[PDB]
Amino acid sequence: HSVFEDDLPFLEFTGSIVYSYDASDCSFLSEDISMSLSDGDVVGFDMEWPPLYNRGKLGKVALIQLCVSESKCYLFHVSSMSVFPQGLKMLLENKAVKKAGVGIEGDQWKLLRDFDIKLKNFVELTDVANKKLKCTETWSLNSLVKHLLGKQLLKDKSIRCSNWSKFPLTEDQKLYAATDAYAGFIIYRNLEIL
Ligand SMILES: [Mn+2]
Ligand SMILES: [Mn+2]
C-alpha cells in the first residue's frame, strides 16, 4: 500500500471535557457558552445515539457535543435528563451561533424528530472544504481530519457504536464523542484561509 494508505496517528482531544447529565445544569452551561461567544462564532457540532432501533428508526438522540474552543468541549447527555434543557434548545435554535460538522443536515432531521428542536445556522463541512480548498471532493469527517491534520479518527467500533444512552458514559465514550465535535471545530477554523 502507498504512503497515502498509511495509518495516521489518532485525533484525541486533550482539553476540557464538560460532562452534563442534568437539565438545569445543562441550561446554565449553555448560558456560559453563550456568554463566552459572539454573534457569528462557529462551534463544532455532533451527536450520538444508541444502536438499537426504535419503532422503525435509529435510536433516539442520547448525546449532544459542542466544541466551543480549541480547549473546551461540552457533552450534554440529554438521554439522562428528565426534560430537554431549555437553555440548550435556545442555543441550538439560536442563529447567532454557527454549528459545524459533517452530515449535520441529517442531524437536523433527527433532532427535529426526536426532540422537536430546530437546529439553526449549520454548515456542512464537506461544502466548506470544497469551497475554501478550491476542489470538488466527496468528504467525510475522517477524510478531512486526515487531509488537514495528518490524523485519523479513533475507530474502536465497540465504542463509537456503543450504547450512548447508557449512564454514565465511560471515559472512552466521552473522549470519542468529544473529539468529533473538536474535529468539527478545528476543521472549520482551519478552512478560513484565502
Ligand atoms: Mn455524527
Ligand atoms: Mn460522532
UniProtKB/Swiss-Prot annotation:
It is linked to Werner syndrome: A rare autosomal recessive progeroid syndrome characterized by the premature onset of multiple age-related disorders, including atherosclerosis, cancer, non-insulin-dependent diabetes mellitus, ocular cataracts and osteoporosis. The major cause of death, at a median age of 47, is myocardial infarction. Colorectal cancer: A complex disease characterized by malignant lesions arising from the inner wall of the large intestine (the colon) and the rectum. Genetic alterations are often associated with progression from premalignant lesion (adenoma) to invasive adenocarcinoma. Risk factors for cancer of the colon and rectum include colon polyps, long-standing ulcerative colitis, and genetic family history. This is Bifunctional 3'-5' exonuclease/ATP-dependent helicase WRN. Residues 2-194 are annotated as: Interaction with WRNIP1. Changing residue 109 to A: Reduces exonuclease activity. Residues 24-192 form the 3'-5' exonuclease domain. The chain holds residues 38 to 230 of 1432 of the full protein. It is found in: Nucleus, Nucleolus; Nucleus; Nucleus, Nucleoplasm; Chromosome. Changing residue 176 to F: Strongly reduces exonuclease activity. Multifunctional enzyme that has magnesium and ATP-dependent 3'-5' DNA-helicase activity on partially duplex substrates. Also has 3'->5' exonuclease activity towards double-stranded (ds)DNA with a 5'-overhang. Has no nuclease activity towards single-stranded (ss)DNA or blunt-ended dsDNA. Helicase activity is most efficient with (d)ATP, but (d)CTP will substitute with reduced efficiency; strand displacement is enhanced by single-strand binding-protein (heterotrimeric replication protein A complex, RPA1, RPA2, RPA3). The record marks 109 as: Interaction with DNA. It comes from Homo sapiens. Monomer, and homooligomer. May exist as homodimer, homotrimer, homotetramer and/or homohexamer. Homotetramer, or homohexamer, when bound to DNA. Interacts via its N-terminal domain with WRNIP1. Interacts with EXO1, PCNA and SUPV3L1. Interacts with PML (isoform PML-4). Interacts (via KBM motif) with XRCC5 and XRCC6; promoting recruitment to DNA damage sites. Interacts with RECQL5; this interaction stimulates WRN helicase activity on DNA fork duplexes. Changing residue 48 to A: Abolishes exonuclease activity. Restores chromosome stability in depletion experiments. Phosphorylated by PRKDC.
